[PDB]
Design a protein around this ligand. Structure first.
Ligand SMILES: [Zn+2]
Ligand SMILES: [Zn+2]
Ligand SMILES: [Zn+2]
Ligand SMILES: [Zn+2]
Ligand SMILES: [Zn+2]
Length: 139
DNA sequence: ACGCAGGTCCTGGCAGCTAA
DNA sequence: TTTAGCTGCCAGGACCTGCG
């Protein structure tokens, strides 16, 4: 039987100490000593430390470029192989990169939630508002 | 003559498996 | 058997880039 339940997510636990440890994920969590960012688990903190190091241990066998993560390398490989598995249901365009497909499908919605604070022009992507504000920086 | 969007890789989050 | 650590996989984002 499980008698200790979490308030926010509702998970059950056999002992209260296990509930106290889990509840730190809704609040004392592991924190990076350099940038002071808090992380859910300890393994995620471990992987975050590699961003401070700058090391790239996953090397592409074809071109020789290296990546900070193994899923980045798998994605990169599909570019070499011309594999485009992700396709837009509406416009039919295909992508090797799953984030490129996701970003593309937002355009079919026409939502523009980023508006320029100087001139009021609306943007669908935050990157494009960033560049437009650079133009406003004349002098 | 600049907004638009596609290319490319970096970051962090969980589910599920697996080693301690 | 329990549990912590590990991996795959994924959503989101930043930065560059040429096109119309
Ligand atoms: Zn909870
Ligand atoms: Zn840090
Ligand atoms: Zn390559
Ligand atoms: Zn489309
Ligand atoms: Zn503006």
């Amino acid at each position: 039987s499980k008698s200790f339940t979490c308030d926010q997510c509702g998970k059950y636990f056999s002992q209260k100490r296990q509930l106290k440890s889990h509840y730190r994920v809704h609040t004392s969590l592991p924190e990076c000593s350099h940038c002071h960012r808090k992380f859910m688990d300890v393994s995620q903190l471990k992987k975050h430390l590699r961003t401070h190091t700058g090391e790239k241990p996953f090397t592409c066998e074809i071109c020789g470029k290296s990546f900070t993560a193994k899923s980045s390398l798998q994605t990169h490989i599909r570019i070499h192989r011309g594999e485009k598995p992700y396709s837009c249901s509406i416009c039919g365009k295909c992508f090797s990169d799953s984030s490129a497909k996701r970003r593309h499908c937002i355009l079919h919605t026409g939502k523009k939630p980023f508006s320029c604070p100087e001139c009021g022009l609306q943007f669908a992507r935050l990157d494009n508002l960033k560049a437009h504000l650079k133009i406003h920086s004349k002098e």
